[PDB]
Amino acid sequence: RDRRERRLIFGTIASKMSLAPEADLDSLIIRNDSLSGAVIAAIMQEAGLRAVRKNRYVILQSDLEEAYATQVKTDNTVDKFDFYK
Amino acid sequence: EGKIDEAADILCELQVETYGSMEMSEKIQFILEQMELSILKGDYSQATVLSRKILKKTFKNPKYESLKLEYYNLLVKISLHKREYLEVAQYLQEIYQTDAIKSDEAKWKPVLSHIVYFLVLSPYGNLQNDLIHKIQNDNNLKKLESQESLVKLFTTNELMRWPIVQKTYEPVLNEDDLAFGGEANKHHWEDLQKRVIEHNLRVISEYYSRITLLRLNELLDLTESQTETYISDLVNQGIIYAKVNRPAKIVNFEKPKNSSQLLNEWSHNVDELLEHIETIGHLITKEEIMHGL
Amino acid sequence: LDLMSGILHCEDKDYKTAFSYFFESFESYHNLTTHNSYEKACQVLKYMLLSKIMLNLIDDVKNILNAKYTKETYQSRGIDAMKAVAEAYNNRSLLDFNTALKQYEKELMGDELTRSHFNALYDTLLESNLCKIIEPFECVEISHISKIIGLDTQQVEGKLSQM
């Protein structure tokens, strides 16, 4: 999937999730590449799982990028490798 | 020093992010006092959110002396802004068995008069009949027999002696200390009067099929404009239904036509002819036994 | 494109998903600076308030005007007209609905999408006032009906017979 079609997923799931408008999600939308509907669903679920051990209710900026590195693991690079285009 | 709102804002901005749900001893005790500061501040929403957290945790935890008694007082105090006597009546079901088992009858008698006060002001629901018999009811108490008979009075109450009973005996109503609503006397003659009209008008349909609107105002202690206000609320809430004729001033029952005549009302004639042949047929032998001997 | 798509939701209702079109557009025209005028920016604010009134949410209408992030300092005669309609829906009365009609008629009746929903909200609050009359027993004098509705005898009999 391309970059634009993902915001209709992340943005819709965020309606049922509690988060602050200060969230950094406007950044990671570029980092997101080669995902599906099932993988994105587990990303927002992991954001709330780490908030329990951190004693947090509303999802903060630390609960986004830290929880994103878990379910995103498939291959080391997954984004255009490293150069040689 | 005389600070109220400043002391509440400090605790609400700290204890929420302070405890990590490790030690539940001092945590539960301070949350009970945290909602008390919101009462003096005047914010019912701050205490409502905190009331949904430790309530389910304390229920699973064993019962304690000083801890369980704080929940009974806070749930009554939060009713100042809510002004709903139905919700508090369900919260007092726990203290009813607590003071009658763990405690003695010394402190159980004033709680008995308090729990029945929220029952009389209950607008509707089937839990009213279940709270009539209860368990420890009929304790031979002066305040209990007055409130217990008042619940059963609503069937036969014509509202003729209603201002006399409240004036002669006023234990929980006009003059009271705990669970005392209104500035002085004004909310006691309003909320209580609005409830007894709903209970009286409910049985009028079951008794009076056709009643004059001029006579209906005398039984409910209302006027032509005031009567249409209370009857419209019971119909909108799905309580009862009746007939209101404005120009003719005629209030009928308006029996529903969904029975469809023969399809309903005639089905009740089975027991009329079922008890004829079956009974007399059984008594044929009995006739020969009594006369034969 | 999001504004024109939201216009199709005016007659077809479904204002739940239509809010995302008008919300994302308001932030788009706010950053145009000189490229956008003040009137075009206020109309977008009127479309958001008009869409939430059709969706019947009181708390969300107040959050748009009170919060400076949603308002972005835009106010006019037609914008304040949506506040009177939101207050008229809370109390369910046609007095406050027609109160802002006479003073704001310049901007309020100027927009076609607002005037198209004016008669819709006119009957919406009118049907809600009838639900209080129709719920009890019928056969009540018309003179007492107009006092509850708040309009003239000829107007109440004309609108009631239309439904």
Query: Could you identify the residue written with the tokens 């005047």?
Result: B42
Residue A17 near residue A47, CB atoms below 8 Å: yes
Task: Choose among B94, B91, B113, B110: nearest CA to B102.
Answer: B94
Resolution in A: 4.5
Q: Chain B window 17-46: which residues touch A at a Cβ cutoff of 8 Å?
A: 17, 20-21
Six-digit token pair at B8?
A: 């509440």
- B245 touches C at CB < 8 Å: yes
> Which chains lie within 8 Å of chain A at 3 or more CB pairs, if any?
B
Residue B38 near residue B47, CB atoms below 8 Å: yes
- Min Cα–Cα distance to chain C from B232, Å: 6
Residue B235 near residue C135, CB atoms below 8 Å: yes
> Which chains lie within 8 Å of chain B at 3 or more CB pairs, if any?
A, C
User: How far from chain centre, in Å, is Cα B275?
Assistant: 42
In whole angstroms, how large is the CA radius of gyration of chain B?
27
Task: Choose among B132, B181, B180, B182: nearest CA to B153.
Answer: B132
Distance CA B108, CA B172 (A): 15
How far is CA C22 from each of CA A73, B96, C44, rounded to the nearest angstrom?
A: 37, 55, 7
Experimental method: cryo-EM
Residue C64 near residue C96, CB atoms below 8 Å: no
Distance CA C13, CA C116 (A): 13
Residue B148 near residue B116, CB atoms below 8 Å: yes
Residue B86 near residue B125, CB atoms below 8 Å: yes
Phi, then psi, of A55 in degrees rounded to 5: 60, 50
CA angle B56, B62, B67 (to 5 degrees): 75
3 state SS of A56: coil
Six-digit token pair at A76?
A: 């080391």
Task: Choose among B227, B180, B225, B226: nearest CA to B201.
Answer: B227
Distance CA B85, CA B124 (A): 11
Which residues in chain B have Cβ-Cβ distances shorter than 8 Å to C141?
Answer: 246-247
Distance CA C163, CA C127 (A): 9
DSSP β-ladder status, B250-252 and B210-212: antiparallel
How far is CA B113 from each of CA B76, B146, B179, B196, B269, rounded to the nearest angstrom?
A: 14, 10, 10, 18, 48
- Which H/E stretch holds residue B250? strand B250-252
3 state SS of B135: coil
Distance CA B188, CA B181 (A): 7
Query: C137–B254: do the CB atoms touch at under 8 Å?
Result: yes
Question: First-to-last CA distance in chain C?
Answer: 36
Helix-helix angle B25-41:B5-12, to 10 degrees = 140
Phi, then psi, of C43 in degrees rounded to 5: -65, -35
- Residue C14 zone, left/alpha/beta (φ > 0; ψ -120 to 50; rest): left
Distance CA C107, CA B173 (A): 55
Six-digit token pair at B141?
A: 């108490």
How far is CA B82 from each of CA A50, B44, B116, B190, rounded to the nearest angstrom?
A: 37, 8, 19, 16
Distance CA A10, CA B174 (A): 59
In whole angstroms, how large is the CA radius of gyration of chain C?
18
Residue of C136, C139, C141 lying closest to B232 (CB–CB): C136
Query: Could you identify the residue written with the tokens 């002001």?
Result: B121
- Annotate chain C with three-state secondary structure: CHHHHHHHHHHCCCCCCCHHHHHHHHHHHHCCHHHCCHHHHHHHHHHHHHHHHHHCCHHHHHHHHHCHHHHCCCCCHHHHHHHHHHHHHHHCCCHHHHHHHHHCHHHHCCCHHHHHHHHHHHHHHHHHHHHHHHCCCCCCCHHHHHHHHCCCHHHHHHHHHHC
Query: Could you identify the residue written with the tokens 């009067």?
Result: B193
Task: Choose among C97, C100, C159: nearest CA to C130.
Answer: C159
- B3 touches C at CB < 8 Å: no
User: How far from chain centre, in Å, is Cα B22?
Assistant: 40
Six-digit token pair at B179?
A: 């669970």
